[PDB]
Symmetry: D3
Subunit: 243 residues, 6 copies
């Protein structure tokens, strides 16, 4: 069956994201700005729900959007009794109209709207789907981190339990602001490779994009702990609200 | 005295020839009109006029224009006092220039947008604007920690440049300490940089479009290895 | 040499003002009306800042010319200038607060000298008092493999100082050359120090009867971490 | 089997198209004779043959030539066992190629001189030799400390490359660890680099002259910012 | 664990063979017919190199599975395997030489534990004996700011190990993850250590009755300098 | 000329001859031996060699530098000779030939270094040795060749700022020297073309010499990847 290849990749992705990007940091960071217990969350690029389920475990009701039907398939299988509604859609152009208390984009998902005009269209969609007093959250690596080796290939290998491992190889083009991550997930007798390419935006770009789209950046933290964003920050956690 | 030192540093460290050679590879200058924004004491303006151009040189510093005039001799340069964040005249030009990093002296993003609006309003239909910039990645190589380099300025003068930066505010501060055998003059300039991606958006808001970027005065395309960011803009 | 002391006082006044030390110290212990022992006081930049927060300051330096400059500058500030070696303090007296301004602690060069200093600090602390070692994080000194680096700072409109630094990681030695210039003047001096990491200081403190009870990463008082560039050590009697 | 693993690594990480494009920009290949030295399993040789060249391909590894001949099909490539430090046949060619860093596998300087002498002896009057090399400054960036990068090789295979260097001996060692879900094949190559300055000297000794140097397959001039050192040599 | 110990023995045998340790020790104390206490002996990579130089070896480790492997490999070599905690040795023998192989000293984590370890070394040295701490220079652990880095090494033709390290400069903590692989096998283990600089070690040694008497920068015996990447510490009594 | 006086002060303080003398003495005796010191300048190297007992012939193309040498010479056995070390015309042989720190790089083109080395071979007695005192050129590349400045004291009343740029493809290194007192400023510059040890081996062979030793510091450590100096000992083939 052909789609087993993509299913195995989605399973690997879910394992990598579960261990290397748990939802807890996003949940801790969002909660420092807005209450989640009893509120509504629009989670854009929910994937297999690592971010979505952690938001639900904080008491939120989550509407979780992804363009990948197999990833939503895995979310529904793992959902169990969690209050997460899986929705197939393109976060560059949301068709349905509703408004939420908080909107979230997990670590670097915002950079998967590649072109600047795609980021703008995405932000217009976030504005249109935000309650007047709502706030949207862009969980991002500070893009300075992507330029540290001149964009040359670098590889780091992490354990995924004592039976699995993942090697991440990353290259970047500073002029196009492109970053490409190859993921090689291995067990004793298995190897699954998949990749993902993103176009980053700096905080200064996001201020202009937000302004174009009808949003305003109202806060930036430098870590999940809520420290303010400074030159020494390695993360760029953007809070936005309607103009 | 500080304006004199400023003029010497600019004449030696940022001569106008590269800007002229880079602008010339995109637009002819002999006989064309040029609006030179942030002309200062005129180092860029003079080099443009000497390429054939009728130049209108604009600066907000009356004392810098004073020295432009005393050094202009017979070059075709009309010095004008004005704020390039809000130009108040009605001319239209073949070519608009901003010398090395002058663009970064419109500090806030809204000020760069107001400046680029003014530039669009003063371009002829087929004109082109030129932003001579350091690639801002260069400002970030030391984490923004104070670094100093010392340059000769002839056989009798020298300048020490000490720079600090804040990457989050995109601020860069340059302190200039100009010395002779028995003189010391100090001055500083602080700028807010913007990346090419930022400039693409600012251009669009303002009514212009980036139509080319070069990586050096020689005309290499702008790549991740470029250390300069030479932006060409046209009306959309 | 007199011109050297003037140049030193100007550099310290501009690039190491006492305001930061006073703010940090005030985060942990009150100064208004308390007694402060300021060790390695120099020409008084730290000491005057401490006196201006209301402390009764006893200021100790081994450099009689520096103390002379301190006394010239002192005016009515409540600072007593004492010539002495802080590796071996001669007088008996206990204080609410003991201070060592930025990197002065590293001027007791050998580890045994640092230990002798810390014992003196312990013997001059009131039971509830605290000692404060204001230090650069010594990781900062190893940044270029100890190779010579120079940075030039303005000192107002008409003066400047170029600081050239070299370090030897194995001896934990750092050498700073200060070249102070005006239009028609040039004065050079130097200072060589031996740094100690926080881990070393914990040991030396314990040997001397002190305990490291707090470490801040900057004058603003956030905790010391791997990302800190300053190492501001609070110590108390055991 | 290490031969199979090497062929896979080279086919995907250093295909011949780059070398072919670079050589083409200096000499035509359609219908010409080409001597490909250290041809290996023929990644370079077959790209050259597909450009229309008649290729004699020399390697000292008979298992590698076995793989070449297995892969050849109808491509115009003659496989020859030989040591390019001492080529013992007499034919004369239009173009001589050595693929990425193969020139560095003649280890000692005298071996490199012997190799270049053989290249001169096998070049036709208006012919040209091509040394495709990394710029050796790239090998010193980490002080020669061990560094590892892991590359995909399609969906179900990968190679980890671990490199160490010795600046004083100009030695670079590469370990290749090729893996699939249930396989692991390891092999290594050790090389001795030479800078452009050394190559100019070795060339004159051997009877050649460096006539061009490019910094990339796209034919940019070689400069301080180049990361490749592509050398064109002609007979004296 | 059984496969974990085997993976460890392969990694140790190939990435840190005993030959270097023995050549270094032998340049300070000839070993033929001497008694050697090898602390943190593991599966005996250091212990058997020492025995092969002619020493009579007591090899101490807290891991019974590792000592079982040592005993399986021992054959005729003069090594006695003893289960014990080197922070607190309960037997009373004395030795010409005490060895701790590469970075094993850093596995006595806290400063107080290193001191107890060093006291135990002193109590177990004969008159004129010497102890040898084979360490990486901890400056190496601070490149990259403690950020995760990975390096992959072959282990023969058909096995490999990827070592991934992270560090916290303030805690002086270094964590190494070892991922050992064959064509169809994957075994992961890890070790976390607390480093100490030479300056720290001098102090701990003195607190424990010992004295740093020599420091080499490599197994070849050249002196320890700012350029050294290894810190090979020689200790003797009083 | 003030430039030469500043040159002498900078060279005397930032590059004393003592290290060269100690390194050379660890390979050949100097006491009563003959030394050809090429590119002697104002004699910082030549005088330190004479203090070790050498009978020194000191060659330089700058007549004003030689004038200052003769003026500082006083007692010492140093004969100043105006000449071009790429084309030495006198005919004498010596026990030792020296080139002080980085002077070998002032023979700019590779063919000029080869002519120099041929002259060295022609002026060495059999059994003699030649010494090229050099910075390891890797040091010139540490900043990608970007401008870097370091300021050194020159006593209490003088200083010098050295600003260096490099072009790794041309193997060019440019040093600008800004010498100051309280009331003076004198600027001058020197540009050189470096050669690596591997280049020097080949150039030596072409010229009839052989590299027989390389040290990594004046102490005589061996030359390794961690060395920051490249001290080359050469002998006739
Ligand atoms: N235009 C688009 N519209 C919707 N989803 C998109 C998209 N572009 C990318 N995605 C999705 O964005 C996801 C990014 S990975 C993050 C997944 C999840 N939030 C977690 O916490 O792990 C992928 O699932 C991808 O399919
Ligand atoms: N609105 C404005 N805001 C900031 N700087 C302005 C300005 N209008 C003019 N300037 C001038 O911008 C100049 C930057 S320096 C560049 C000067 C000149 N083009 C040269 O080639 O040297 C200063 O002279 C500053 O006074
Ligand atoms: N052993 C010692 N005993 C006393 N003072 C000493 C000393 N070693 C160094 N010092 C003094 O410590 C000072 C260091 S500079 C700090 C000066 C002052 N606290 C300020 O804030 O500027 C010098 O004045 C020096 O003379
Ligand atoms: N004398 C010699 N010394 C070293 N390697 C030699 C050699 N003669 C041939 N070679 C070969 O040089 C090759 C280097 S890699 C092979 C490159 C091949 N042209 C490709 O494009 O992939 C090896 O195959 C090696 O066996
Ligand atoms: N407190 C302690 N007491 C005894 N052994 C300890 C210990 N802490 C760690 N160890 C042991 O120290 C060893 C470190 S690895 C070094 C093993 C061996 N010397 C070799 O050459 O390979 C491990 O075997 C571990 O179990
Ligand atoms: N071709 C050449 N022939 C002779 N001297 C030369 C030369 N090229 C450069 N020089 C000289 O080489 C000298 C280099 S500076 C070193 C001077 C001296 N040995 C010392 O120890 O300070 C200069 O004096 C310069 O004039």
């Amino acid at each position: 069956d052909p789609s087993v290849y993509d299913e195995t990749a989605i399973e690997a992705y879910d394992l990598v994201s579960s261990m290397l990007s748990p939802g807890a940091g996003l949940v801790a960071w969002v909660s420092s700005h807005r209450p989640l217990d009893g509120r509504t969350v629009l989670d854009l690029g929910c994937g297999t729900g690592v971010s979505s389920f952690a938001l639900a475990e904080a008491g939120a009701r989550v509407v979780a959007v992804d363009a990948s039907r197999p990833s939503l398939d895995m979310l529904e299988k793992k959902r169990l009794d969690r209050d997460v509604e899986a929705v197939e859609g393109d976060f560059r152009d949301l068709t349905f109209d509703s408004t939420f208390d908080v909107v979230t984009m997990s670590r670097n998902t915002f950079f998967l709207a590649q072109e600047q005009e795609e980021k703008i269209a995405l932000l217009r969609g976030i504005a249109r789907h935000l309650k007047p007093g709502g706030a949207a959250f862009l969980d991002c690596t500070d893009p300075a981190e992507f330029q540290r080796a001149g964009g040359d290939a670098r590889s780091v290998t992490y354990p995924l339990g004592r039976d699995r491992m993942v090697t991440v190889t990353q290259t970047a083009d500073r002029a196009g602001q492109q970053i490409l991550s190859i993921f090689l997930v291995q067990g004793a007798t298995t190897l699954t490779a998949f990749h993902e390419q993103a176009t980053w935006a700096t905080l200064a770009e996001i201020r202009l994009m937000a302004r174009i789209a009808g949003l305003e950046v109202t806060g930036v933290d430098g870590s999940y702990a809520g420290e303010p964003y400074t030159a020494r920050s390695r993360e760029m956690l953007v809070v936005l609200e309607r103009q």
